Amino acid sequence: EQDGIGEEVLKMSTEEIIQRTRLLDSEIKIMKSEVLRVTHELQAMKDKIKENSEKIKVNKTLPYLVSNVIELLDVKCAVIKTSTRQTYFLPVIGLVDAEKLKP
Amino acid sequence: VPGFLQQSQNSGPGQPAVWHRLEELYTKKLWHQLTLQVLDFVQDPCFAQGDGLIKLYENFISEFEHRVNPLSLVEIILHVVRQMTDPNVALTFLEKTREKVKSSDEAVILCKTAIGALKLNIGDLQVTKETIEDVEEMLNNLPGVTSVHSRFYDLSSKYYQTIGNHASYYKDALRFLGCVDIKDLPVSEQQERAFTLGLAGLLGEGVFNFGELLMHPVLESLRNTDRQWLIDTLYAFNSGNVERFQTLKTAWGQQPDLAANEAQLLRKIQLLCLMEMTFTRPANHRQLTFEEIAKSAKITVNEVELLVMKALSVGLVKGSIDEVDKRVHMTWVQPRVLDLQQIKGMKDRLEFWCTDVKSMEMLVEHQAHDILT
Amino acid sequence: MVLESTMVCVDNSEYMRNGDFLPTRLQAQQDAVNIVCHSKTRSNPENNVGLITLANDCEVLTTLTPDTGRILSKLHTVQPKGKITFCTGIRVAHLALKHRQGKNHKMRIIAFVGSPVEDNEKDLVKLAKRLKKEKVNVDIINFGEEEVNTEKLTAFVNTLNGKDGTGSHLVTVPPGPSLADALISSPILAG
Amino acid sequence: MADPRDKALQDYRKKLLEHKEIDGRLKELREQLKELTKQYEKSENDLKALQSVGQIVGEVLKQLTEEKFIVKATNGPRYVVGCRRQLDKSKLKPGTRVALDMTTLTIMRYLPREVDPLVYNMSHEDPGNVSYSEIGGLSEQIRELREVIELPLTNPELFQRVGIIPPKGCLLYGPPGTGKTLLARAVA
Amino acid sequence: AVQKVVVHPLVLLSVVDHFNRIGKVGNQKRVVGVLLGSWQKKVLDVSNSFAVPFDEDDKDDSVWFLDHDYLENMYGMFKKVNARERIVGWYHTGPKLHKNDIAINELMKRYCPNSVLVIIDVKPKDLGLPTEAYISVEEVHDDGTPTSKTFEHVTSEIGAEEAEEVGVEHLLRDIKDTTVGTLSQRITNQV
Numbered sequence A: 001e002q003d004g005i006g007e008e009v010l011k012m013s014t015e016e017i018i019q020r021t022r023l024l025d026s027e028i029k030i031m032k033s034e035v036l037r038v039t040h041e042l043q044a045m046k047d048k049i050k051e052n053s054e055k056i057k058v059n060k061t062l063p064y065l066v067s068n069v070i071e072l073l074d075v076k077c078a079v080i081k082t083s084t085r086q087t088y089f090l091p092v093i094g095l096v097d098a099e100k101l102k103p
Numbered sequence B: 001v002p003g004f005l006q007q008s009q010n011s012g013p014g015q016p017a018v019w020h021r022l023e024e025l026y027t028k029k030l031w032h033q034l035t036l037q038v039l040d041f042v043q044d045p046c047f048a049q050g051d052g053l054i055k056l057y058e059n060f061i062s063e064f065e066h067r068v069n070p071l072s073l074v075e076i077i078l079h080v081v082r083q084m085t086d087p088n089v090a091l092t093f094l095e096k097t098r099e100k101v102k103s104s105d106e107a108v109i110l111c112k113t114a115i116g117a118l119k120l121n122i123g124d125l126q127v128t129k130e131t132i133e134d135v136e137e138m139l140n141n142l143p144g145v146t147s148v149h150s151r152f153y154d155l156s157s158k159y160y161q162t163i164g165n166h167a168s169y170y171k172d173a174l175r176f177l178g179c180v181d182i183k184d185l186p187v188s189e190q191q192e193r194a195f196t197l198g199l200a201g202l203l204g205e206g207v208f209n210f211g212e213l214l215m216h217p218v219l220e221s222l223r224n225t226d227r228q229w230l231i232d233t234l235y236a237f238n239s240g241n242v243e244r245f246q247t248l249k250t251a252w253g254q255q256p257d258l259a260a261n262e263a264q265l266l267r268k269i270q271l272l273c274l275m276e277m278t279f280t281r282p283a284n285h286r287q288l289t290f291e292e293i294a295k296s297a298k299i300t301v302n303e304v305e306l307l308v309m310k311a312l313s314v315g316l317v318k319g320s321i322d323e324v325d326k327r328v329h330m331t332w333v334q335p336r337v338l339d340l341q342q343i344k345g346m347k348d349r350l351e352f353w354c355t356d357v358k359s360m361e362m363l364v365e366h367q368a369h370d371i372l373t
Numbered sequence C: 001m002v003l004e005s006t007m008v009c010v011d012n013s014e015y016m017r018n019g020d021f022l023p024t025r026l027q028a029q030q031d032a033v034n035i036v037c038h039s040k041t042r043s044n045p046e047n048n049v050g051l052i053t054l055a056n057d058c059e060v061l062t063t064l065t066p067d068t069g070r071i072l073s074k075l076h077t078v079q080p081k082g083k084i085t086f087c088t089g090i091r092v093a094h095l096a097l098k099h100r101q102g103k104n105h106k107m108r109i110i111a112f113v114g115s116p117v118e119d120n121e122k123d124l125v126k127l128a129k130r131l132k133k134e135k136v137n138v139d140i141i142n143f144g145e146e147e148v149n150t151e152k153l154t155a156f157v158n159t160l161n162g163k164d165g166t167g168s169h170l171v172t173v174p175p176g177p178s179l180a181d182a183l184i185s186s187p188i189l190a191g
Numbered sequence D: 001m002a003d004p005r006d007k008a009l010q011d012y013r014k015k016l017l018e019h020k021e022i023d024g025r026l027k028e029l030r031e032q033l034k035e036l037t038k039q040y041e042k043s044e045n046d047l048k049a050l051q052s053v054g055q056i057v058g059e060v061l062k063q064l065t066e067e068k069f070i071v072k073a074t075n076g077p078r079y080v081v082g083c084r085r086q087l088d089k090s091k092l093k094p095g096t097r098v099a100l101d102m103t104t105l106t107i108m109r110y111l112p113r114e115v116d117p118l119v120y121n122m123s124h125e126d127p128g129n130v131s132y133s134e135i136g137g138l139s140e141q142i143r144e145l146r147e148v149i150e151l152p153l154t155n156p157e158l159f160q161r162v163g164i165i166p167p168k169g170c171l172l173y174g175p176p177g178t179g180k181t182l183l184a185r186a187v188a
Numbered sequence E: 001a002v003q004k005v006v007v008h009p010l011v012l013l014s015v016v017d018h019f020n021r022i023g024k025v026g027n028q029k030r031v032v033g034v035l036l037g038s039w040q041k042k043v044l045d046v047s048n049s050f051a052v053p054f055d056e057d058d059k060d061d062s063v064w065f066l067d068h069d070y071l072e073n074m075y076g077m078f079k080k081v082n083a084r085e086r087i088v089g090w091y092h093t094g095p096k097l098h099k100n101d102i103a104i105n106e107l108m109k110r111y112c113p114n115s116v117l118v119i120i121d122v123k124p125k126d127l128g129l130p131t132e133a134y135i136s137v138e139e140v141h142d143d144g145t146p147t148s149k150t151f152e153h154v155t156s157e158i159g160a161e162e163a164e165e166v167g168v169e170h171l172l173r174d175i176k177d178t179t180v181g182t183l184s185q186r187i188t189n190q191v
């Protein structure tokens, strides 16, 4: 805070009307610009994650087949035998994490 | 602040009509006719000693500014920093005025050209190439200003006084004078621009002469009276002859930078006469004899093989060489302008080609009409 | 309750980057957009308001919708960097209003002129008699610095609606000191 | 406020309380949009994940022609199939494991084989590490071990100078407890 | 960098009917709509499209109307029923193309960066012309030349997947240009 007082000592008509506008006027115009850009993009993307979550809700629907994961691969990949005694493959697993799964 | 110009009213002639008009404009807080008025003062050719007397007022402009286009604001401070005439504090003053608008208006790119405009005179290598390079890193997404490339050439024009900037200057001298359009300044600077343009393609490596510049008006309309030897030696290149008289008379005319590269002159024309003697006969007998090269290029017999392997190496021809007959076969792929009177002969080739297609199509259709169906 | 299609026309030229109106001429015309969009909304929940610019291009950034929140969002980052082009601004507002999805609405245009316009007197009176053959009321409200009541502006307003027409006001402002109180005096209830 | 050093000091000490207050919440808005973009990334992964079909596991019995194969499902019948475009038909050998389309029924992707977990006993234990510094006093046999085992697989050029083959293998005979496994584990 | 575009035969087909939709009021002689796509590689794919209200004036040829709001919602519909598909560009007809196509393209490049346009030829359908597609690049023009736009061309083709050849082969039923030809078939290919 020494330079805060000390720059008010040296140049009394050179930056007291000037520096205390220029980096504050350019601050507040960019702050006025970027307080509304992010806020509008916040509210828009809450709506899109709402609509996607409603979309996943409809296509994630009972009844379910049960099965048992036999093994797990990555080239994330799983080989699944159903309790219909049928072995399927899927390259993409779905609404879990692969690391959270176990055979 | 109004009295600041009431006491600094002098050196602008017609003092009431421009200074009392001035204190109308910023006291109504307008900033465009004000900007046109201050642009009118600085564009005025005077000594303009009051740059320090106006930069306090220009700081007074930037006090209650809050609106003003930094494009024209930096366009007028580059004349002010031209008037300062002391490059040591001028760079520090420029970078302060550069950083005061880091906003979305790209005048920072022409600040960097204004850096090298004062730095290709002092400190000429270490960051001049960097302020060369940084501009086309940012010269992107927008050809609409075109003063961005205009001033980017202006540092490259000062970069012409380096060693290896002859063809790269020549490529950029077309880029500038293509992107700027109007003539907007007299012959007495433009004809020297054409003069250094003709020498830059003369010394340039990949260029042969790159014709239609002979068609391009900024040399033929501007040097049709003086330096006609350069238009003459561009005639001899685009007409490909040795023509030893006038292609020596350019060395009689041009004393610097031409005798030092006279070997490269004779090197270029002896591989430029090739792509016209193969242009003469239209591949009916393109098997050219070696003596015709030794006659036209007036080179000896033993050098024509290194001469044609050179033009094959550069890639302006894709022929081959036999030596049991010492004749040169020619399959040629480097085309150029063909001078509208020879579009006429090109039309007649196309019509003979046209009627041979149509006639013996009708012979086939009439012959096999019964089984075509 | 009345069915019309309001096409507000703002300026974002260079000549709005100055301050004869004390906060900002943009904020002066932005608050003018606030009071006209709330007026047409509260007069009828069945009308619709779309915006059109005129500087350097004419962009139809919001279409003629009864929504207003998108319009208020597009009022920001307007970037007043252009140059006024006005003869195409009516023509891009009229053929916008021939693409109306509700073709029972009336047609009314309001326009914000905060720049000196440079146009032939012949071009606008061809546009004025075009609107006479097309029945569109246009409200021209002058802002910014003001070459006030030109032969261009007055004869266009007159030939907009002659022989007991609407009364589309060629609204003039004091350049600076004074808010949109005169802007809500006559046209917002008696156009 | 033109030039009193007291009031122009207070000219920005009313401003700096504002201009940092408007800057404080904005980086918070930067953080909240950053977390929402991370959450939107997970949603779009699931929109990709929702559209997959699932495949049929089978094995190739033989190859008939350049495009006709004979495969067999794990529990079902035999079939005649083809490739997709570029599935490297030389790599499909009789006995490999493949994955079939559900409806089009042709081969999508081949798979390696990881059968009968008795032989799956090589991935749970360690190779060591033992690096000939733990083993004691048996080095004369250790050097004789390393020529016939280590030097073939590391260094075949020596066996091509004189001209000699052998990767063969040893027999370790000796009463139990001494070294009969560590020498195997050290060279492994 | 586009190798070639692949025209699915529902899109052209869904242009010709929409030209016939407005043909009862037909005075525009051009139809502009939105071209959905599926970008896979340097080769492009198109399999769906729709239309959009558009008008154009012969005088000054620079007052034109793509509808953004109609382009927002109906693409939001086709995204909802099929999330595989997205926009890749737009189309028009009338092979003597209006020079306004710089302005149409540079608007809706804010929807797709490498936007692309395909010209179909509804009425000229006779000699050798299925369609035509352009690509948008902008140099200055050349070395010592002024600025320009210069639409460039990418070659095109008509594609085919299963369960549209089923729709094709059931709809020909007359001559079909039958499978692998006889003597008469090859000679006509030479004719």
Ligand SMILES: Nc1ncnc2c1ncn2[C@@H]1O[C@H](COP(=O)(O)OP(=O)(O)O)[C@@H](O)[C@H]1O
Residues within 6 Å of the ligand: D134, D135, D136, D137, D138, D175, D176, D177, D178, D179, D180, D181, D182
């Ligand atoms: N020479 C040696 N150096 C290091 N460790 C040894 C040595 N001899 C025996 N041991 C120890 O004795 C244990 C038994 O060795 P092991 O190889 O299992 O016996 P066997 O050879 O009968 O299988 C090992 O854990 C090893 O640590």
